[model samples]
Target: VAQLNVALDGKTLELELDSPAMNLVGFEHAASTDADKAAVAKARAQLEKPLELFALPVTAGCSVASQELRSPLFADIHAHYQLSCEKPELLKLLTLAEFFKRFPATQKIQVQLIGPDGQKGADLAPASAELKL
Candidate 1:
């Protein structure tokens, strides 16, 4: 299953994405082989650009904090990102469409959101990638 945790505190937004490695990295095994290492390298490189991964507006000022591809224990990958925005109100309008569009292998994403108002949960599908607040 794919899951996303989001928290916004007026000026900063913290986000985390956790899912099967295959869903995020197109593989579920450890990066032992040369090809696997190359794929891991590529994934790490791609994650450096949080805007491209989440499709956030450049104005959001998003940056990736960390990312990991884990296997053996549990085939999964985790990505942690943060966004600093001048207008937090606009963040409510943000959507995950670009993320789903980029990672078609992800079928559904369960979201836990915490904002100025309160906390809520929502599900996003590839067909409807919006994160309703």
Candidate 2:
């Protein structure tokens, strides 16, 4: 299954995503053809904009601090994001609506969240992606 791991401490937040290439790129094979390369590029563009996919509340004042991604020409895609929030306390929900919208082929994303309060692991689908913190 796909996975989303998150951690929060004070004003800093971290997120990691692991999923099969087919979910985002529409295929699992190598980028040997022009079309394959184009699809991979599109998928990378989507990964580059983690803020859009995460949709953190505006009140939290979060901005991307750093990001890293890897998509080998094989089975999987992986990405990590570091975010700095000006008002972290105001963040109460973690929603992945935009993620599902962009990657509709993804069936589910198992989430693991670690925050100041505690930790939670929720198996989430597009229909059940709102996680309350």
Candidate 3:
């Protein structure tokens, strides 16, 4: 679990989070014959919960570059969603090994990035591998 601080109405709330959404806002087309946008308005309201509730939901996506799993042979890949937040909650969660035991098949893993400049972000795979053993 990763900890997150969300600001709502000038107050911050803490939470442990677990998933990401590829895009925050979806596009739609409307025609003159379409009904009044009450349905769309309702959906937009609902979208705010998941987007703001999870710290990482809006920023995760498939890698832009292919990854090589073998010595120069890239691992075949699949798209997956991820969750992220801050580090405080991460430390409290079970070790990497334990976390993946329950969420296996997240073959490549990364960390929730938090820092003054986010310049210290690093891979979480090593920590995960250590935990697996």
Candidate 4:
């Protein structure tokens, strides 16, 4: 069995998983459009029976402005891209890689998005302050 624990703010959540003899089945991913729905179905067909999986809430969050924060734009951007909150207009400004490159003095940064189903995707600041080849 595998156990995972996560804490956000003051609340904590726990997850337990069984292996081998224990099996999981009937896992589904949310598909917003016809194309997305078909894609998930097709992939499921290729996999073996008795799969262990569950829908994840795709969400994105990152540390920003250690001091006083004004606009909700930062949170808005993360939610928009992750599909939780729609704001296609800000896509250009949401590019993390480009932002980091443009702002070399940035001390720390993190960005991500989560789908409505809890699946999260994210990107982080550089591994090091200096370029390494």
Candidate 5:
């Protein structure tokens, strides 16, 4: 259960991912087992790397400016990412399925985007997850 809200302003791409802990960690409770701990760590690592996680265009030359993760819970997970692109015009489309591939527990995502090219919204699944810009 994840909803991704994205906004592109000039060369800045800001993203917010909000989801239940179950979507990322397979559990909603606090970590007790070692496996649970590892799951958080693994997901956290991926969350910190927005460039790779989002699979942004290499030629777009995007660099992460911020990755803010918050979720002290039994619980929900809120992840924020801000990146600046050196060549924003190179951004043609986004590979949304790449996100599902990394977090399979997230079966679907409802995305809303707003930016220079205009607006786009879609309900994405691993089966179909490409957003044309």
Candidate 6:
């Protein structure tokens, strides 16, 4: 299953994505072949462009902190990202619609939303891809 964690604090927003490599990289094995390595590189590049994957504001500066493509049982990919904005209060305007659109292989995503108010869990699918902060 795919999982997404979102946390907003002040002017910073943290996001973490954990899922099978097949869901993000289109492969469930190690990057041994040249083609596989290229695919992995492309996937890493895509991860850097969070604005393309999600409906976040251009003013929000997003950066990938760390990404791992390894597993003991199944090939999994885990990514940690941080987003900072001049107008942090507007951070809640972000959405994940584009994320689902970009990663069609991810049929569903279990989201953990944490904000100043509190925390909650949500199930997002292709039919309902939007996540309101």
Computed on alpha carbons, the lDDT of every model, listed in order, comes to 0.72, 0.88, 0.28, 0.25, 0.87, 0.73
**Candidate 2 to truth, TM:** 0.94
> Residue pairs in steric clash, candidate 2?
none
| Tens digits of per-residue lDDT for model 3, 1-133 | 2222222111121222332211111222331223424433433343234323222222232111221111111112122222233323232222344333433433434444333333222234424433110
lDDT score of residue 42 within candidate 1: 68
Quote each prediction's TM-score.
Answer: 0.81, 0.94, 0.25, 0.23, 0.93, 0.81
Model 1: per-residue Cα lDDT over 6-100, one tens digit each = 88887787878878877766777776788877776766676566767777766655554444534452367777776676765565555878777
RMSD of each: 3.0, 1.4, 15.4, 19.9, 1.6, 3.1
For candidate 1, the C-alpha RMSD (Å) to the true structure equals 3.0
**Per-residue accuracy of model 2 over 14-107 as CA lDDT, tens digit each:** 9999998888988878889999999888888888988788888888899999998986753889899999999998888899888889988988
Write one digit per residue (lDDT tens) for candidate 5, span 89-109: 898887776788889988889
Q: Per-residue CA lDDT of candidate 6, range 12-115, in tens?
A: 77888888888776778787888888877777776767657767776555544444434433277777777665666655554667877777777888999898
* Quality of model 4 by C-alpha lDDT: 0.25
- Cα lDDT for residue 59, model 2? 86
Candidate 5 TM-score, true structure as reference: 0.93
The regions of model 2 sitting more than 4 angstroms off are none
The Cα error of candidate 5 at residue 27, in Å, is: 1.0
Q: Candidates 1 and 4: which is better by lDDT?
A: 1
Worst 10 residues of 4 by lDDT: 74-83
Q: Which regions of candidate 1 are displaced past 4 Å? A: 59-74
Error of 3 at 106 (Å): 1.3
Task: Sum up the clashes in candidate 1.
Answer: 0
